[PDB]
Design a protein around this nucleic acid. Structure first.
Ligand SMILES: [Mg+2]
Ligand SMILES: [Mg+2]
Ligand SMILES: [Mg+2]
Ligand SMILES: [Mg+2]
Ligand SMILES: [Mg+2]
Ligand SMILES: [Mg+2]
Ligand SMILES: [Zn+2]
Lengths: 77, 189, 191, 52
RNA sequence: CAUGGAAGUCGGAAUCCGCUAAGGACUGUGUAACAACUCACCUGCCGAAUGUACUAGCCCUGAAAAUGGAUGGCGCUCAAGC
């Protein structure tokens, strides 16, 4: 849903890789809907999961979704 | 073999902290069953089973931390798991017995007891009558529903179930198999 | 490199009798009697226990040791045949011309012979006579089945292979002309 | 026409084979060396190509 | 994400985490697509060796000519061969 601007019609015929989205607490807020559906202990694993889930987007700017999830240094909530 | 090395410290660390160990005899049980019982017992107790421990408990038996391990040495035979928990033995007697699944037949599974279909109305679409005619079951269509007038023996106890009857058994939601957790003798009780 | 001692054992059920003399095996049980001659192999037979037969080779080479398991399985097959018998099943496969067979009864002696007509629409009448001790039936369980049964695996299998080998197509592409008679199932008479 | 299971049974005996590249001998599907002596037990085998 | 439709399996580029001894942004089949099945992988049995390349001794294929034929002959196999 976040994507990039609006996915206007007749634009998906060519490459549609312009779906870059920001990497911030907005994704962590969106993770509460899933709420660690499959175990994940206290949802720390789910937090890493959802963070690295947008691996195509490569997070925002220099930071990468995989690097962000791999580095266990952020707050739980 | 990183997980192989990681298993050793977990087993020795976990055995000493928990004074109570419960043995479980689980065999041919679906993965989802262990998933659900793991989530049910997630708050209290941790369940973990693995390959046979030929010398990994014998090393704990050599040194004196628990003289009672060598009493439990001969109890391991095969496909037996261990449960580490801190709850009472009385309360854990029937704690893990929940969620007994209703295993369907597997096209030839030996039925221990004779299987019978009680008289009644099946209620399904009458397009399936070819399945009944395959076994030659006397069926009469009433109000668009197939009704079995007279009970017909499906398979003798201890005999292989016919593939057509076994397939019909899936949609009929009746089977002789009920799979559940197995309780083994623990601490010579 | 010569191996000092190689040994194998065969258990024997409490139903049949076995006697060996000059490396000649005689097996007799509820369903009949069989004979085999093994004078061409240097093996030492012995009775290990109350119901176990042992056989072994001393100072044998690799090639000599190889035959020990063959001998063991042959005698085990004899035991199976004398206590449960054998049964083979075969199927007929034709595309256009139906193939007709006639398994007439004993021809004044114990041998059976099966007559095959109308193979790929040919007017040859072709005749094969099987070894004694093999019983042939046309199945009534379902359509287009031939049943072979007997006591000895070697004779039952050889007769079946004779039937398989007699129906051959010549001067044609066999990837296209799949006409013929083939074996489809092997098992025991009991269970 | 031939029902598929019978066609598979018949194909098992004359379609799924290995072919030696030196003497054109028929070999079992999983064989690795030719059994004939005139080619020297060569290990240059190719599958029998199907008909299509 | 495109998408009748393509929940791995026209496809594009990515390819993470949960819980395990292991069970996948999937190993195929299958299917509108899924599911299913299987595979992979670990475990239940088991009971001591295994796999992958190379090196050289003997033997074999590679090894087709004209009168009948020559390790000197007969013959020889834990040799009467090396
Ligand atoms: Mg031609
Ligand atoms: Mg030479
Ligand atoms: Mg010479
Ligand atoms: Mg000389
Ligand atoms: Mg010598
Ligand atoms: Mg001399
Ligand atoms: Zn060859």
């Amino acid at each position: 849903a976040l994507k990039e601007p609006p996915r206007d019609r007749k634009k998906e015929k060519n490459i549609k890789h312009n779906k870059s989205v920001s990497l911030d607490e907005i994704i962590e807020i969106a993770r509460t809907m899933r709420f660690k559906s499959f175990s994940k202990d206290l949802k720390g694993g789910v937090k890493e999961i959802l963070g690295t889930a947008f691996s195509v987007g490569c997070q925002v700017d220099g930071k990468s979704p995989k690097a962000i999830s791999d580095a266990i240094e952020a707050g739980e909530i | 073999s990183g997980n192989k090395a990681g298993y050793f410290d977990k087993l020795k660390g976990l055995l000493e902290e928990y004074p109570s160990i419960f043995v479980v005899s689980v065999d041919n049980v679906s993965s989802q069953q262990m998933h659900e019982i793991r989530k049910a017992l997630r708050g209290q107790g941790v369940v973990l089973m693995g390959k046979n421990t030929m010398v990994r408990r014998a090393l704990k038996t050599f040194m004196p931390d628990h003289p009672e391990y060598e009493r439990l040495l001969p109890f391991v035979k095969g496909n037996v798991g261990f449960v580490f928990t801190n709850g009472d033995l009385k309360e854990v007697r029937e704690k893990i017995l929940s969620n007994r699944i209703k295993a369907p037949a597997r096209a030839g599974a030996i039925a221990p007891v004779d299987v019978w279909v009680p008289a009644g109305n099946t209620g399904m679409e009458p397009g399936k009558t070819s399945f009944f005619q395959a076994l030659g079951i006397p069926t009469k269509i009433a109000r668009g529903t197939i009704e079995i007038t007279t009970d017909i023996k499906l398979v003798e106890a201890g005999a292989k179930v016919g593939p057509s009857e076994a397939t019909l058994l899936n949609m009929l939601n009746i089977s002789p198999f009920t799979y559940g957790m197995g309780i083994a003798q623990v601490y010579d009780q | 490199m010569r191996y000092i001692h190689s040994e194998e054992t065969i258990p024997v059920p409490e139903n049949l009798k076995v006697s060996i003399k000059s490396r000649l095996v005689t097996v007799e049980g509820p369903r009949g009697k069989l004979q085999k001659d093994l004078s061409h192999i240097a093996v030492n037979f012995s009775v290990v226990k109350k119901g176990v037969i042992g056989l072994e080779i001393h100072h044998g080479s690799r090639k000599d040791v190889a035959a020990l398991r063959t001998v063991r399985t042959i005698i085990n097959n004899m035991i199976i045949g004398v206590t449960k018998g054998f049964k083979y099943k075969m199927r007929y496969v034709y595309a256009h011309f139906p193939i007709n067979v006639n398994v007439e009864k004993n021809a004044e002696t114990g041998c059976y012979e099966v007559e095959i007509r109308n193979f790929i629409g040919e007017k040859i009448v072709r005749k094969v006579v099987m070894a004694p001790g093999v019983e042939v039936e046309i199945s009534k369980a379902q359509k287009d089945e031939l049943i072979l049964s007997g006591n000895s695996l070697e004779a039952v299998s050889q007769s079946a292979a004779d039937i398989q080998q007699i129906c051959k197509v010549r001067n044609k592409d066999i990837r296209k002309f799949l006409d013929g008679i083939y074996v489809s199932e092997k098992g025991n008479i009991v269970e | 026409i031939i029902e598929p299971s019978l066609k598979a049974l018949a194909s098992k005996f004359n379609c799924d084979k290995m072919i030696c590249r030196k003497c054109y001998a028929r070999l079992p599907p999983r064989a690795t060396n030719c059994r004939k002596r005139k080619c020297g037990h060569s290990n240059q085998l190719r599958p029998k190509k199907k008909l299509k």
